[PDB]
Amino acid sequence: MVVLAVLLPVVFGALLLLGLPRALGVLGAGLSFLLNLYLFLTHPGGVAHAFQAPLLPGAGVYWAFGLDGLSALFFLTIALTVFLGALVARVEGRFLGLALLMEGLLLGLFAARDLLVFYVFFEAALIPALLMLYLYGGEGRTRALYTFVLFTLVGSLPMLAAVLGARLLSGSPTFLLEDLLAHPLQEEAAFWVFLGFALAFAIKTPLFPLHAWLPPFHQENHPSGLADALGTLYKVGVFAFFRFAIPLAPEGFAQAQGLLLFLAALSALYGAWVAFAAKDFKTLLAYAGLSHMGVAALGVFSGTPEGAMGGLYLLAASGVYTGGLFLLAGRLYERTGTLEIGRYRGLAQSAPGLAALALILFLAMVGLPGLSGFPGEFLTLLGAYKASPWLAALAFLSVIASAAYALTAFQKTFWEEGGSGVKDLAGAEWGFALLSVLALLLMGVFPGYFARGLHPLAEAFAKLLGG
Amino acid sequence: ALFYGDRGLLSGYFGLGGAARSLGQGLARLQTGYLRVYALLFVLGALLLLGVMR
Amino acid sequence: MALLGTILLPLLGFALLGLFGKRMREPLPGVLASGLVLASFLLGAGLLLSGGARFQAEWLPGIPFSLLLDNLSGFMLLIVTGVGFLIHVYAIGYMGGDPGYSRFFAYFNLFIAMMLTLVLADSYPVMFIGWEGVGLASFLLIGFWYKNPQYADSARKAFIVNRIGDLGFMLGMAILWALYGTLSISELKEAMEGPLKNPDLLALAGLLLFLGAVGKSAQIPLMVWLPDAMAGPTPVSALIHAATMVTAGVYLIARSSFLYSVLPDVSYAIAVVGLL
Amino acid sequence: MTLAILAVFSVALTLLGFVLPPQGVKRATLLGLALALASLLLTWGKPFAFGPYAVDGVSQVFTLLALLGALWTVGLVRSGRFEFYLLVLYAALGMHLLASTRHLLLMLVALEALSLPLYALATWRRGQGLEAALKYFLLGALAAAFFLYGAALFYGATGSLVLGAPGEGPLYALALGLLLVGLGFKAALAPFHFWTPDVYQGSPTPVVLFMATSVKAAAFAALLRVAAPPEALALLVALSVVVGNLAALAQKEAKRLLAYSSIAHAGYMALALYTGNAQALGFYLLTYVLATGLAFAVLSQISPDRVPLEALRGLYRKDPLLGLAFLVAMLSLLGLPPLAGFWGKYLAFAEAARAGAWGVLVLALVTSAVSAYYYLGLGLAVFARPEETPFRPGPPWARAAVVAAGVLLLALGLLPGLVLPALAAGG
Fold first, then answer.
1. Which among D276, D215, D354 is positioned nearest to D57, based on CA atoms?
2. CA–CA separation, A328 vs A225, rounded Å?
3. Are B31 and D198 an interchain contact pair (Cβ–Cβ within 8 Å)?
4. Do C136 and A368 touch (CB under 8 A)?
5. How many domains does chain D have?
6. Which residues of A touch D417 (CB under 8 A)?
7. How many domains does chain B have?
8. Contact yes or no for A211/A274 (Cβ under 8 A)
9. Which residues from D are below 8 Å from A164, CB to CB?
10. Which 3 state secondary structure label does DSSP give C260?
11. φ and ψ at D53, to 5 degrees?
């Protein structure tokens, strides 16, 4: 059941960390992928594989798991992304085990059906990221680590008082999301609880003032960027907002909605814009991820089941293709020796299919119709225009700068006059490219099939913002 | 300009961390090492507590 | 269901010439491209002679995948496919000893398929899909000879201007979703007849649609991207400037003729911009 | 009848050391402590009272913790003076008596009986050790005077010297405050914290292990008996945690930094005092005792006199198991999931939020996030390049002790629903 798929990446990452060899972690990530896909298929509903086990009888904490329509596809998304990061990595430092561990942790996080277990996994995911950051690369590693970690922790620790208030002040017997939603909070207490939720959920989104950790995190990881991909999969802020924060304390979100929509708009614009000014792949992708998270947050904050489903879908798919771009940058580093955008321009003629792969990925990033980004982007546009048309329009001065920075980077890396010549492709990179393009094309052409579980959750939690 | 502004924002975050550290070292400077100083600060804290109790 | 093959042929052909592509002799990619264009022209003319075509498939909730082949759609389809076959033959001729024959004619097939997706659409989102696909194929073909920087920044500017126009398109579409909730041109026209509502918002949506059309057909101010398409090979410049990528501007208005026919100020502004 | 075992062994070994080698006397002390711990286990669920002496779940749990800390700190000490074991035995019995009574005056007698031998155990004769011992003795006698006048004002506000009496208004409040002053000084709460950094820096590392585990355990056990007002509790927690973590930021030395961290941790534990659950606090203190004993056993394997921060670096390369256990201890003291230190922190915060203290809880959490700076500057430093530093990689004694401590920490972090069910009567 669910717990088996949740735990499989954890045990495989352990067997890569202590045990040998590196190669087994690739097929371990593949098995996680297959089981998560099997759970994604034949999925009856949220309860699909319900799991309830005693953890803290006296305190009221139980292991609560199950695949929603949200949990199912997020399982599949993370399994796939980490499987790519396992096969193509070329890090092979024996911290691919750390990567698989973080995968299993993210799976449990999404499978969390109770607030305290959700919180526990949210805080636990910090350790692998910090390690694969610290000991496997980076010179400003220690300071980037302190920045990212201290930001996450200062945001998170008050959210423990927020969840304690959400359970106690509502008279909820346990931390189960079912019970917590069955006991809603009143005005000027749900206010403080939603504020305590929104601090952590915005700093982990990230939004405009709180994104200052994202470039330092992305730069100083292992140059292959497996740690960077897994950190981009760690941007669950939108999922937490939609699932827990707003449904648990909508009264505060009612006042904060204008501010949140505005922040999301400015984040999207600022990220897509500064990404142009970015001179390196890590910073560029950091600001790109900031812009995408801004759009997703806008979609969720608009209410508007359209915008909400758009935000969630955009979140999953942006995690996917951003991790792919990270692994691609890491492989080009392993073969060349630099992450600079200006140098080594001749790539297009020397690289037969890396040009086409990076182009596919950047097009999926800039939100081109037919690829994964556009469905979520358009639903978010609709919902944001519904909620605040002005903020929707401001947020969507983003496609321009997106296409700008993406085409600029692609051209100056590949198209121009031939240099020395570059290695063509690795055998693992071949499967990486094929599967990445396959997933991107499927999620772009059939956003109907996927997110079918997302539509009921979106419309229900958007109508929750009504009377 | 927005890139430089983001850089400066990150620098201000650093400044806040350093303000916290400075406060911490002022509080560590509060401990000079003289027993008379420690005892005076002790009696001071105790009287503060007894007043707060009302 | 058969209507989908018209698009699928110069997509399977594009995929062959992109993936294997160079596993073929020099004439063979162009021959395949022109043959798929011809045996798509024929099979679409048969459908037009059969009275018309319709297709509806499951997609985004509330936004299905709707293709309508009528008189107006078939006129554009025959124009594009015929001129595309002619320029395909002319490109078989004009391209010789040049590496990337596969790339060139795969991009040609892609351009044809994207233009077909644009014109054959009962929904404004499918119209927008075709729009961005044609913009991408234009960028690719203008930057076909990548070893020259001059013929890359041209395509970059082209696509940037194009995405400006496409953002205006998206905003108009969000307006004509917030307003009605159909976004399928047929039911949107049938819902737009009678007591129009929020005339300011309707004129704004029509104005945004026209803003997109301006970027696409290289009108003022977004004109500047068209001349630099000279960077692209001459058959590419022919296909871009004559049969495709500009005609879509007029087609959007003609399909939205119900919308613009009730927007006198917007139609007058369109006339002024065309004159200038 | 564990106190009987303790007194018998202490009094017997007092004279036995004349005919027995100090090694034999150390073996005897170890056997006695283990036997008392075994009796505590076999009496689980057998509360036993004779006079003011009362053994309940609290007595059992906290004396278990103290016995564990004493066993660990005795294992390391190999000095050929059997008195260096007699004093540990005396302190153990004194802390048991402290945790097992409500009588204020017997509490004072137990406090003196446990504290006096520590003053003498703080004398490695290093010049700083005498300064530390002097500050400790003077501030301890002052706090004993304050606690005695509080017990007198308690006897004034009520006819008995036993806690739980109904209590008056301002005078009872005054008596409660005069008792809380001494109890917090003994628990290293600010603004009574000044002694702790100096004493931890001056005293030998195994002694500091013994202290930071058993002393804090027994102190919080006796604190749970007091009915501390919420405003006073709020003030203590705020000042303690803030000053602790902030001044720990500035610390260049591992022992002093850990002292300030222990001030912050006492501030944390003082939250469970809002409700006095003692199950939450028993669990918290189990976790904290294990982690701190681990860390200080490693610091003892490094250097007894003083260990700087850089000395910790390269500890993984030197001994991987030791580096990993030190990392685990730093995380458990940071209070991060899925560790038993986090579970103790969560239980204390749950007791606090149940008491309805919100701003105080928020400030505690902010200062705890501040603590992560130095908690990571210690745990992660293990992987740095080894600089010039004395390193003696311990005996299998200390290796297995440190490893078992870390294993117990992580196991009770993953499944606290094993022991936590029995921190009450013990079913």
1. D276
2. 9
3. yes
4. yes
5. 1
6. 54-57
7. 1
8. no
9. 349-350, 353
10. helix
11. -70, 120
- Nearest chain D CA: its distance from A101 CA (Å): 14
The range of the structural domain enclosing residue B22 comes to: 1-54
The two structure tokens encoding residue D85:
């074991």
Pairing state between β A51-56 and A61-65: antiparallel
For chain C, the distance separating the N- and C-terminal CA atoms, rounded to the nearest angstrom, is 43
Among residues D184, D364, D351, the alpha carbon closest in space to that of D280 is found at: D351
Q: Could A209 and B3 be called an inter-chain contact, meaning their C-beta atoms sit closer than 8 Å?
A: no
Rounded to a whole number, what is the distance in Å from the CA of D313 to chain A's nearest CA?
14
Q: How far apart are CA A390 and CA A298, in angstroms?
A: 12
What CA–CA distances, in Å, run from A217 to A94, A211, A285? 21, 10, 11
Element (H, E) at A62: strand A61-65
What does this entry list as its resolution, in Å? 3.1
| DSSP letters spanning D401-416 | HHHHHHHHHHHHHH-T
The number of C-alpha atoms within 13 Å of D353 and in the hemisphere containing its C-beta is 25
Name every residue whose Cβ is closer than 8 Å to that of residue D289 and which is 6 or more positions away in sequence: D65, D68, D69, D213, D214, D216, D217
Q: Which residues make beta-bridge pairs with C55?
A: C67
* Chain A residues inside the 8 Å CB shell of B6: 211-212, 215, 270, 274
Contact A277 B2 (CB under 8 A): yes
Are D232 and B49 an interchain contact pair (Cβ–Cβ within 8 Å)? yes
- Residue pair A379/A310 in contact by the 8 Å Cβ criterion: yes
Rounded Cα distance between C136 and C141, Å, is: 9
Q: Which phi and psi angles does A102 have, rounded to 5°? A: -60, -35
CA D394 to CA A221: how far, in whole Å?
35
The full DSSP string for B1-54 is -HHHHHHHHHHHHHHHHHHHHHHHHHHHHT--S-HHHHHHHHHHHHHHHHHHT-
Question: Is there a contact between D222 and D99 (Cβ–Cβ < 8 Å)?
Answer: yes
Per-domain residue ranges of chain A: 1-467
Structural domain of residue D255, as residue ranges? 1-427
- Amino acid at residue number A290: L
Helix (H, G, I), strand (E, B) or coil at A49: coil
D385 three-state secondary structure: coil
DSSP 8-state assignment for residue A113:
-
List the chains bordering chain A where 3 or more Cβ pairs fall under 8 Å: B, C, D
Count the residues in chain C: 276
